Structures are given as structure tokens and as C-alpha cells.
Amino acid sequence: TTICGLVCQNAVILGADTRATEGPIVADKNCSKLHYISKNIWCAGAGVAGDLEHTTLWLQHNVELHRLNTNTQPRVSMCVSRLTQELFKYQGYKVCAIVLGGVDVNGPQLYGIHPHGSSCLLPFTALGSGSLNAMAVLEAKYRDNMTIEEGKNLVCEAICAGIFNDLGSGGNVDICVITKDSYQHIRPYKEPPTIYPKGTTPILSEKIEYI
Amino acid sequence: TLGPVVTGTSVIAIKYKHGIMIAADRKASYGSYAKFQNVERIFKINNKTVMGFSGELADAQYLHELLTRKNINNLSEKKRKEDMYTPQHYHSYVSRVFYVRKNRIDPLFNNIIIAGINSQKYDNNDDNVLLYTNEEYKEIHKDDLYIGFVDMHGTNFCDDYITTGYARYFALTLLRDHYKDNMTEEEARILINECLRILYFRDATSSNFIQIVKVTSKGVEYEEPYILPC
Amino acid sequence: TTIIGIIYDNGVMLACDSRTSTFISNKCSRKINRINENLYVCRSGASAHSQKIIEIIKHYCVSMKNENRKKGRFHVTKNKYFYEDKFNDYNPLVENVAHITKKIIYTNNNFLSCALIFGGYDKIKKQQLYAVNLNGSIIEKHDFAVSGSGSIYIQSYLQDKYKKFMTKKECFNLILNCVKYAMHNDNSSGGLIRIVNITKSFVEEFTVVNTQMNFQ
Amino acid sequence: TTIIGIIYDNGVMLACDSRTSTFISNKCSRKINRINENLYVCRSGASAHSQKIIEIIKHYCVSMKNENRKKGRFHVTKNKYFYEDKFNDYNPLVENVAHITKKIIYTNNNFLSCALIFGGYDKIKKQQLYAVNLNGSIIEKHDFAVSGSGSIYIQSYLQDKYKKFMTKKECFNLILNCVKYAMHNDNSSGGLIRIVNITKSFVEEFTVVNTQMNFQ
Amino acid sequence: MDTLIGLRGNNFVVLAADTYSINSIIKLKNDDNTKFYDIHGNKCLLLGGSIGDRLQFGEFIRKNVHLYQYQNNTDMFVKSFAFFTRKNLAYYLRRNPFEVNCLIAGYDKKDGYQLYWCDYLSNMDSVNKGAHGYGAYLVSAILDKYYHENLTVDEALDIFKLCFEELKKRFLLTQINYELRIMYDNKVETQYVTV
Amino acid sequence: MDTLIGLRGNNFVVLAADTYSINSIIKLKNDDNTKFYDIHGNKCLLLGGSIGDRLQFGEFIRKNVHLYQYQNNTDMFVKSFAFFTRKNLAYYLRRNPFEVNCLIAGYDKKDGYQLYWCDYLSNMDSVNKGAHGYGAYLVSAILDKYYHENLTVDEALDIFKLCFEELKKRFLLTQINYELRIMYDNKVETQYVTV
Amino acid sequence: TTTLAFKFKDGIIVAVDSRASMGSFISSQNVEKIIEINKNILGTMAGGAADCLYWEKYLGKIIKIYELRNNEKISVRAASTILSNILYQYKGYGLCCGIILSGYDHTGFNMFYVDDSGKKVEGNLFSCGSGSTYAYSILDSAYDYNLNLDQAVELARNAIYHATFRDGGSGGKVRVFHIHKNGYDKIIEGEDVFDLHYHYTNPEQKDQYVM
Amino acid sequence: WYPYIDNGGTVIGLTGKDYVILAADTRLSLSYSIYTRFCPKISKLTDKCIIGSSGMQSDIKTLHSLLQKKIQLFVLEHSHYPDIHVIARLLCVILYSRRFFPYYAFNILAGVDENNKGVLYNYDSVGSYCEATHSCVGSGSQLILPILDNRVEQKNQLIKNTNFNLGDDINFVKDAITSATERDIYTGDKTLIYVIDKMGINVNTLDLKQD
Amino acid sequence: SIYNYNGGCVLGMSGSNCVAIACDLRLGANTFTTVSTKFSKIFKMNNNVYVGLSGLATDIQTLYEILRYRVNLYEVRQDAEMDVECFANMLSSILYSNRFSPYFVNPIVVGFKLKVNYEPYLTAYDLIGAKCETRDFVVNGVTSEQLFGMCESLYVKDQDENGLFETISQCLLSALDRDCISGWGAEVLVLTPEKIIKKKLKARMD
């Protein structure tokens, strides 16, 4: 898997590939790894798929509950705090390496969360098997002030590097641009038979039931 | 050799218009201890073959001694410049060494890059070979340039550019994204320096004290080691 | 990681590198954390363990500071902050925070691997250095404290160059040189250097970019 | 154990502690061994392994020195001894002995855990320092070499105080202070300090009693 | 090591088990009475595995089923009985597992004669012919070859005699004593077959 | 699992062993022929253990002893035979050992009727009555109770029948087939006892 | 694998399946497990296919040399002893061979069971493989020495069928050879057991067969 | 130190009436990274016999070089080129010679014998082998073998089409390798297809996905 | 290795206004002994929701009982059928509630999302609830690699109920014939908004 994120002017760009693997076998060709936490907060994950998915649902719903109660725009700091507390409560297990981006009152904030409960504020990060290739691209080309278009191009190139250099990564390129006002989730941002004769398969019995 | 103790980090090698350019930092480590920082991790085998290593230093030095003996034997039995062993010969020799050690569960804990020029058709340096003392560069076809990778298990292959260690992730991405045929020396240096900067930033075992070696129509040139500009 | 603290005439200087993890997962990390306006702590060991310990200690420090408030009235890039509490009336003592940290770390020391260096200033004992060690043993240093895989290389160096009553300038120079040597020798430490200087009235944070030139 | 070697103009200087083994089995052990009149070596690691390696290397050095002899004629307690060979005619080269040591240690590096520092003088390369590491990798140092559990603490210290062309007196002071700091910080090193000074024409052997005073 | 056999027809169901209580390398008994657990209502739980686990699990199931049949004043259905037993075995599977193999047999007016095969891991299924223990490896095939849905009880008993003969000749443990339950004609009959 | 029994009297010696050849949980045969090794000269080596080890060790010993008796043109003494066998077992004890239990029986004019008990470790001793295998734990005591030095061969065979009965009833492996060697009156007889 | 052999009035019947599998994956269902040692002796393959094949061909080589040297046909007992002695020299190396050598020699029809452990059990009815227990049960329940060639073939075919039916590691095609005084004959070269299930157990073929 | 690594990649063999097809990918990979996108797996043994192996690349290359050495020595000694069957027995013996430290290389020996019929032998690491009409070794073998069984055998289809030609088989093999590349992370990049018929060996290339 | 004890495989596919769920019928023991051949792995939750459970047989039965309990409660309390997507989410959460001591089951959910429009709905899971929604087919069980090959090579989009039946049955049978511990009969269920076709295929018993 390859997930990456970076902070551009007044926005956060997350990107991810679209492949899930049951080991050597490609189990899903169009999996979605960018996860909606709140309107201004998104997350992407690597590790045990069930852990990522259910931890993300838990965080999303808790954040919505908090927003309803406090009538205040959620905070990336709150999300990372809850996530770290939950991940630490389990002594390492429930492995979830998460790139958590958002835009709040304190601007665009990107965090990297380790499975053991450690968080890091970052300008750009990558996680997954293809993490090193995405990091190579980001390091080589990243710069402090970039437009949303430039951020999207950099994210796409990094994810493509991961896809075409990591065997565990492949498929489409999902990206999401989160701003303090809204988000756009470009799901397919980039996208790099026999008909048997009727009655060929023998049967032993047939039962017809009409609903 | 139960495991690596003194380790050398990434090595990069590429083909450019005028030959082979191989870069490696001059650092050796003792675990997380940067104990040596002026170590020569690229070895000249003969006028047209050079050797880069990653991993244990003792095993790399043993292999370098073996290849030095082989080069001296070849020079002793040499009569014309075509009798000199090519880089491909030395690559096959190193592969056989690693395979035989794999069959004895006594591996060398190294990844080796054997690079050079396979042809005697671009110069006459080996008509009178000099071992103790050191026009324009002649354009060399990329087919006459050899770069061979070998790993602990003996996995041997060749390519237009090779990387070892952490370079196989960071440097290799840039190389595959940007490498092109018939590159000038300036462009090759720019690309390799960008790769080495990434490695310095993301590899804890890498150093910014670099060693660049060129294998060209005028033999093997060892550059002045330099700290990475920025 | 390399975390160091040095006591000079009119304050205490904490310094740290920023490298995290043979792959450098984070090359710009915040190892010196601001527990309180007058009290900082440097982290080393497991990042998750240390970060959660800091969160707990910040919670306890907020509680302590709030409870202290008595009733009624009385009477190279740098960032400088003054203390909002001018007379240290309600700021929790550095020793109190360091010792509650020691208690927390010791109670759960079967799996918490965290080494901390507390630097601070209170009106009782002025400027202070405490070292909360791996297994939960606090030691109050009066000259300097060091920790991390990179601070072993500078030990002798530091011991040679330390003086009893440094000036701010020379203390800053010494701590910077210590961190630079530790980064040079230790592969597990590197990146921009973060320094915090705590004094009677203010705290200032410096960020330093670095390079080690020596013609030995 | 702490073994160090420094290079000053007109000579090289080896230094070592003498503590052996949390029980000090031998508090005065000879680590700097005299391979040849102009060539000494410092031992570290397993005492038995290093001692046997030294015995083997002395055997080989005697063989080499005898075979070198061409036919015909030509032309603080200190102990000083001039070289019997005035022109280094038959004295084996430092590099030769160090490299055969590396070969021996590498061939049997599955169980031989020995780290050595060779200091010497021959007419080809003048004074030389070589470091033979754990698995049998030899590195020729041109400024200084260090090894042992106690030499880690002085690294930065040494790197700061070394100069390219130290004099004999200041080099002696530097190496003595290095060893003293190493023993102060390292529990596995201590006892009287043994220093050897190898030069073009003679070798001196100093023994130093020590104490680490500081007002940090 | 406890050989259990079960056979189900259109008008009968027969359970069978060797009669051996074993302790280490010694036969405690050749007349075991801890494998069959008759449950009022033409139900039978045949248990294998270690004797203590057999006793505990069988008695737990038997008393719970009788408690159900007394409180409600009705006979528990054979399918309900079998799935209750499988549920109870699965509940302990991960806490305090009874290492017991099970053949649940019974006749009911709703589903006829029923034979359920269940293993110590609680993998249960309805079958027409089943076996448990090492002896299974030497009897199952026989049951497969000589079975037809319209067997008479006497033919079933002859097939059981074939199985016992193969267990005496080819099975490593020369088992010779067997006890048989024969539910049919609204009656449960006990038989003892030697050799 | 290979029960061996040996009994020695003033005027006889009887060896006995179950006739099962086993492979996993199945009896390959109910009439084995790999435990007894008759050696020319009224000698017999009864081996227990694993069939491969039994075959290898027994045939090695048998051909070495016959080679000795042909080269020298004489009959090896039973004591010499037994101690040669123990020596050969001990030699391989520390190099690809044969895990074989041994009873050596014979008759000589020098020492009369002779029985020797030897374990896979090659701990050997002369005995009057011995056993090997798990069945030993159930037969040795019987041999102790009903033995006297002046037994007739027929009384010895009745004691062996007692042992076989106890091996059928109490031993977990209901062993029923046994083969007996009876050396007495200069003749060596083979007998087969079922049940 | 499920191989079996039994001796009857007219000679020997040898039967085998043809499945080779690597764990739970069926790699082949056309394996020839009955190997010809010489013109009169047949062997089977149970367990390690490479070990059995190599060592049975090696035994064939030894037998051919012996026959050339002594101008005589070797006996089944001698060949079985040679195989067992060779397999014992490799005790402890993990050889997994279960072989039944059945043939005709000057002493009549002979059949021996030899496994990698060194066994040399002689008998007149044997079975090897994961399905050997089912084969033994079926054969014992209906084995008679005076069966005619057709009856013996039917019995062997039915036993192999039942073994393949109850055993996961057995299946494919049933092959039945008849060893007589003048060699051996492939009575059934190969018959897919798919037909045998719907001949023996579910002939009406109007519903799923219930076990 | 474990002396075995699996470099991935797939080889598919398929025989016709008088032709044989061996199509193998060329990607060489370690764990989740790619050594290279072109490392040929198929070696030419003689003008009518080739070998393609999957497993650990160094073992495969040494085994292929040894086969070529022994075949050339055989030609120079016995003055005729070995048949595919001779090569097959030779390779079986070569593999079993390392029975206790086996080559980690599963092999497919394809060729056209003297009688101009396609021959396909499939081998596992320790030497066990069998002739086949369709085979597949490597990471994608479990994905592809059922496709070959459904197309070449049609065991479970009443209406059967049997007339196949070389072009149809080549397109079928291309589809099979495409599916393997789609579902196997270790399969991809360029694939080489060798077709052996009376005129000899013809090599074609096909591009596959690069992720 | 736990999944090797019983074997089994389940396969779901979708067409045009139709959806097929098939499974093998074996129940084995100790990975090689076939103890039953009528052990169906397909369970009906409601007319529009079917589940196929593969893995440990005891875990399959326990999970089916739990799912039936939850679905019956939901439907009675709402007086309406559970939506297929809601059932999928509930199954995921039930699986994940046992993350550390899981039911060793690899379920697939098949059915129709009602919008009337009947859109085929398919999804697969791992033992801890990690779910993948897929638009063409889903596979679970020991035969997963062979089934993925089959549905990769042979899947045709938008097939009518007969075409879908033929394709899914061929895929399942061809995959099973290469698997030792799965097979012994095949069950196939083709749902269309009006009816269900249940067929038992004539399969190998090896």
C-alpha cells in the first residue's frame, strides 16, 4: 500500500493507491484508502485493514458526536489525540499507520500516527510498503509554498512512484484536497470473454421458488 | 561471519554518455556508531572494471583481495589487450563465489556492484598496463557498458543503472523516473547528487561525504571526495 | 536521540536533535516539550511511551497550577516569551512535576521505556535539572544532565568544558557544540537543533542549522 | 578496556588502561604488547582470543623479519629503547603485520572476537596506525584510532582536541587525558595507564598513576 | 481411541461403541458405561475422549435436557437437542474445552430418525453414517460401501458386525467388545457384541 | 508395543512374542516373522522394537554368528553369543543406534539352558524370567509368582498361557496371537497360541 | 495417494490412484504410481514422489545389472531386501517412501511392503497412502483368495474408489494391473472416479449424495 | 541465515498436436521490491527443447547453466543431441542429486520429440516430475492451472470444443498470463513466449502491466 | 492451518438484474477425511440478503446463529427487512468485536440493494471484518487463489441469469477440481428480483 499527504497553501492533499492484497494475491483492484473523518479532516491508513477501517469509523463517529455537542468545527489535534490514546491503550497491537490531514482554526495540519500511539506534525509524509518511494519523490520535489494544483501533481507523482516501484501497491490514484471550507475527493484522479453454451454444466437437481 | 558488524551503506551506479559513473559515501558504521567516515567503498578491479559494495566491510575486503589476485593473474597471462578480463567476467566470478558460499551457508554479507566497460574497441590503455601510477572522452554505446548486481544469495543480473542498500528504494525511484540514455557528465552528476541528497536526508547510515568514480575511455578516474552541496 | 541540559549563571539550557528513527521516519521532531511556561522536558526512548507520559504530566501540571492559585489579590531563529505569572505564585514547582513523572513512569515501568530530562525555574530553588531515568529513578543534577544514544559520545567532552558559572553566551556555545558532536558521531541523531533557554523571567527557543568542520 | 592511538609529528603514541574484568580479575593487565622493536599493538575484546592472536602474529613477525635479511654488508616511570636495526632493513612493515593479523582474525571470525590497534614505524610509510575490527576489517587511520568499551566516551573529546601536527609533549598530554576520561566514565576500565611512544629511532614506555579532579 | 459408530435409516438409528475404560497402558474395564447417555424421549448422546471429560460433558448435557423436558413438560426435539449440545461444546471451546467427540442420535415425529456427527471442535453436521476415533479410519468406508437408505435394522447390524470384524483384524487396538443402541419401532434396545 | 517373554528352567527355555507387525494405527500383519531369529546351534535372538531396526540388527547378528560358526567350524556358546550381541548393540548405542529390545536364549553343554535380557541401551544380564515391552508390566509379576527352578516345560507353557490371558484382558492392546520357541531335550519347537 | 496390492487365485492385483498434491493444492491427477521394476515385478508410489521414483528406478538399475551378471531373474524377496537396505542407509534424512513390490519369481507370487524406515513386511494384502485405511477396510470386508480375475479387478476398483471418496489426498484415475506368470497387464489403464461415484453410490443421479 | 529467497514470476506451458508453448514473465523481485523488470527465466537447451523455471533466481540460473553444460558434453561424447525425454531424466537426476539441500526452483521442460509431438514435463524442487499437456510454475501457478484445466480438459462441460490451433493457443496463453499479472503481485512486466514446432523455436514478446 | 481443518469455499458473482452465490458442500475433518457432503455454506438472511461462510465449521455455525439473531431482532423491531448494506456493516462490526479471539470465518455477503431498482450487492470479508466491496465477484475460502483465477479469466459483465449460472458454476467447479480439501458437491443459488434458482451441480467427489 502507498498513502501520502502534504500541506500546500491553505490546504492538505492526501493521496493513495487502490489495491488490497491477500498476500501474494490481489484481492481488490479498486479499494478506497482515503477515509472521511469530518468535512475538514480526512485520514488514510496502512496495516491491518480491519483495524484501519473500524478505528476510522470509530474516530469519525466520535468526532461527529463531539461536533454536535460543542457546535465547533472539529480539530485535527483532537483527532490525533483520540487516535493516539486508542492506539496506545492497546500495547502496540491494532496496527494502524495513519496519515491524518485537516484544516482547522490553526491552519492546515498534517499528522503521522504510528501504530504504537505516537504522532508527529509534518509538512509531508508517506506510509505503507511503497512509503519509501513516495518519500523519495516528496523529498526530491517538495517545497514549502505550493499551489493546490502543484500539491496534487506532487501527490500523484509520488503515488505513481509507489505504485510502479512497490509490488504491494497498484491500481488507481485517489486524491483528496481538504480546505478550511470544503473538500474535493477525486476518486479516480489518475488511472495508470468466454460465454459458455447454455446447458453445458450438468446438475443433479433444480428447485424454483418465486418470491 | 555470523552477521554484519562494520557496514557500508548505499552504492549507486549509472551509465552516462562517456561511460560508467559510480557514487558511494565514504562512511562505515558500527551499529548506530559512525565510527569511520573516510572509508573507500568503491574498489578498482582493473583499468575497465570497478567494484562497489554495501554491507560488511571485512567480506568486501576479502572479495577485493580475491579480485586483485585474479586481475594480477590475468595480467600475468595477458598478451594483447583483448585477453584482459571484462567486467562481465568478474561479475560471473563474483556470482559463482556467492553461490558456492550460499551452498556452504557461509555467505559474504554484502551486495556487490561490478561495473565497467566490456570493449577494448574504444581505447588502447591495456596495451601497456600500469598498476602503480595513474584527448577528449570517447562516446561509448550503452551496450558496451556493464553494470552487474549480486546479492548474498547470489542473485546476479545486469542493468543500465544499479543501486544497493537504501538506494534501491530512494535512489532507484529517481533513477527509474528520470534516467535517460546518452547522458552527459553534468546531468549524471546532477541526478546522482539528487539521489545522494535524498539518501542523506532519509538514511541514518548515509553520509554527505561522497566518492564519485568514473570508468571511461581513459580508464578509472577517482574524483576528489566532496561534501554534498547543500 | 540526544537530549542535554546545562545549568548556567542565570538559567538552564535544554538542547536536543530532531531525528526520529536505519530509516529516518521524522527528521524534524519535537523532543523538547513545553510542559509549562517555566518548565520544559526533553524526551528519549520510545516515542509513543514518552509522548503519552508528557500528555499525562501536562494534565497533572494543569491541575496543580489551577489548584495553587490562592484567593484574593497580592501586591538560528529565536522566539522569546515572558512569564505571564511574574512572581511564580501558582506555577507548579519543577521538582513536583519531575517527581510525579517519576511516580508515573515507575508504576508502569514493566513496559514504559522512557527517559526524560526536566529543566525549569521556580522561586524556591531557582533553576533546576532533573533526570528521570529508564527504570523510574529520578536524580537532581546541579551541573548538567544528558541522555539518548547520542549523548554518550560527548560525555568526556562535556565534562572537560563545563564550568561552574557559565555566562549565557558560552553556555549556549557549549550546548550547541555538544549536540553537534553527538549528531556527528551518532547515526540515530541528526537534523535541526532545538534549544530552549529558561530563566527567571522568560524562556526563549532557538533553532540552529549545523555542519561539523574539523581538520583533525 | 580502553585502547587509543594518536599520531604526532615524528611519532605515534599508543595508550591503554590495565583493568581486566563486575569483578576486577586483573587490575594491572598488559594490553599494549610489543610485536616487534618498532611495532606495538593494543588488544581489546576477549582476552584469550587477543592473546592467542598476538602469539600467532609474533610467530609470523619473527618469520618475516628473519626472511627479510638480505645477504652481505651495507654501508610516571619511563623506559627508553633504541632500535637494534638502525635503517629498518629487516624489520617487517607495519602494514604487512596488521594485514596478516586481519587475515587471521577474518578466517576464524566465527568465534574470534578480537579488536586490535597496531601502531608502528617503518621507513616506507613512516609512522602508521591500523585498526583491526570485529569481523576482520582493517582500516588505516592517519589521525587516531580508538577501541574498547571505554573509548566511546572520549570520542567527541578527542575529536575536538586533536590537531594535525601535535608535538610530542602535547600529544602525550592529549592521550593521557583521553585515557583518564575514559576510565573515569567507563566502569570496565581502570588502573595504571600504559603508554608507548614509537618514533623513527626509539620506543619509550611510560607508566602513569592517575586521578581525575574537576570542579564542574 | 474411543471408537464410535452411528448409522441412520428410514426406520431406525443404531449407535455403537467399544466398551473399554482405559488408564495409561491398562484397560480399567472391558464393560465401560460412560460413553452412552440415554436422554428421555428416545435421545442418545454417544461421547468419546478422555473419561473425565466424557462424564462431565455428558452429565451436564443430560441433566440440562431433562431439566428442559420437565420444566416445559415436553420432549425436546432431536435437532434442538443436537444443536443445544453443539452450542454448549462451542461455548467451552475457547474457555474450558471438553475434548469429546459426539454422536447425537434420536427419533422424532418431526424429522424421523436422526444422526448428528460432532467433533471436539464442535464441527457438527447431520449424517446418515458417521464414525469417531481412530477406528473411524477403518470403518467409515465399510459404512459407505454397504449402506442404502432402505436398510432394515438387521442388515444394519450385519454391517456393524463387518465393522467390528475389521476393527478386530486391522485396527491396531484389537477391540472385541461393543455396545449398541438400536432405536426403532418406538423402542430403544441395548445389545452387546463380542468379537 | 512388542511384548517379549522369556523363561528358563533346569531342562528347558521358552521364548514368546506377539505376532503383530504394526504400521501407524494399523496392523500390517497378525502373523509377524521378524521378531524371532533362530541361530544354528540352538540359539535364538528375540528382538522387539521397530521393524526396520529389528530386521537390520537381527540379520546383522545372525550372519555374523553364522560366519563365525562356519569359519571356525564350531558352535558359538550361548554366553559368547549373548555378549557379542550386547557388544554390538553397545557399539552403535552412540552412532545410529538400533532401538531394539533383546532376549537371547540358547542351550549349551557348558552352561546348560540360558536366557539373557538386554534393553535397547544394551543393559544386559542373565535371568531366569524376563519380559520386554509394555506387556512386561503385566506379565513379569505372573512369571515371578508361578515360577520354580524345577518347572516342567508343560507347566511353563501353562504359565505362558496365564501371561497371554492377562495380556488379552488387562493390556490395552488386546494381543491374542503369540509365537513360542521351546528349546528342550535337544530340540527346538515352534508353537502358535491364539487367545 | 492410495496404492494397494493383493494376492489371489490367478496372481496379483495392483491398484493405484493418480493424484499428486502439494499441501492442499492438487498439482496433478495423471501420475503413474505403478512403476515397472523389471518384466515381472511392479512397485507402487506412496509418500515422497521424488524419493519413491528415484529409488525404484535405482532398484531397477541394480536388478538389471544383477540379471545380466547372473543370467537369472531376481526374486521379489531379494529386490525388496535391496530396497530396504538402501533406504536404511538414509535413516534420519527425511526420506518418505511407501512401496509395495509385487511380482512373480521361481518361488511363486510374492508381495512385500517396504517403507523408508526400513520395513520389509511380507504378506498377501497391502495398502499404502493417506487412503490406505479405507482400502484395507473395503478389501478385508470382501477379500477372497479364489476370486476370478474379473471379481478381483472389481474389488480392487471399488476399494480404490472408496479410498479416493473418503480421502482428500487420493483421487484422479484408478489404474489396475494384473501380475501373472508371464509379466503383467493393464486391466484398467485409467478410469476417472467421477464416473465411479455415479456408478456405485449415486446411480439415479437426481440429487446430491448424502454422506 | 535462511539460504532461500523467492524471486517470483510465472512460467506457463501448453502442448498441442505438434507444437509446445512456454510463456514466462521476466520480472525479478525481492519481497515487495523489484530487482529488475527483465530477467529471462526460459533457457534454450537444444533447438527442440527449452526449460523455464520459477523460484530463487540464482538457483535457476545455475541449474540452467549446468543443464546446458551437460547437454553439450553429451553431444560431444555420444555424438547426438539428447531427446527431450533424455533431458527430462537427466534433469530429474540432477535435481535429486541435491535432494537434501534442494534447488528452490520448480521447472517446466518443454520441447518437441523425435515424433514431432509437443512434450511438457513439470518438475518440483527435489526432482519428482510428470509429463503434462499444460503446466504452470511460479507465484501464479495456483491462479493459472485451473484456467488451463477449464480450457484444455473441459471435464465439467457437456458441450465440448476440441479443435485447437496454434494461434488460438497463443492467444489463450496471453490471456492466462494477463490474468496472472492482474492477480499476482509477483507477475508482470514483459513476458517472453517460446513456440517450438517442426521449424524450431520462435520467440515473441508481450507487454504486461508494470505495477 | 485452522482453515485447512474443514476446507470449503464460497463464491459470489453478479449479472444484469441477477446475482449468484455458490459454495462447496464438503465438511471434512483433520484436513483429509470427508465426514459430510451435505454441509452447505450458504445461509439465507432474507429474500434480498444471503451470506456464505467459509472456514471453521463451528465458527460458521456460531456466526450464522448470531447473524440470524441480530437480523430477526432488527426486522421485527422495524417491521421491515434489513437493508443489505446495513447487514454488511453489522457483519463487519460483529467480526471486529472479536479481533483478538476471532471466529475463523471468511464470509461473503450477496444480495440486492433496493432503490424499484434491484442493484446487485457483493462484499467479502476477512476473519476480523476487513471488508472489500466488489462489483463483479467475491471469493472466500481455501480455494481463494483458484477462484480468483476463475473469476479473473471467465467473468463476463452483465450476464442474464442463465449466463451467470453457467459462468459461476464453471468457475467454481474448475477451481474445486484443483483443491484437495474442498469439493464433494457444489450448490448454486441464482437470485432475480422475482425468484431463486437453486441447483446442485454434478461435481467430482475427490
Ligand SMILES: Cc1ccc(-c2csc(CNC(=O)[C@H]3CCCN(C(=O)COCCF)C3)n2)cn1
Ligand atoms: C509427480 C509430480 C506431479 C506434479 C508435479 C508438478 C510440478 S509443478 C506442477 C504444476 N504446478 C504446481 O503444482 C504449482 C502448485 C503451487 C506451487 N508451485 C510453485 O511453483 C510455487 O513455487 C514457486 C517457486 F517454485 C507449483 N506439477 C511434479 N511431480
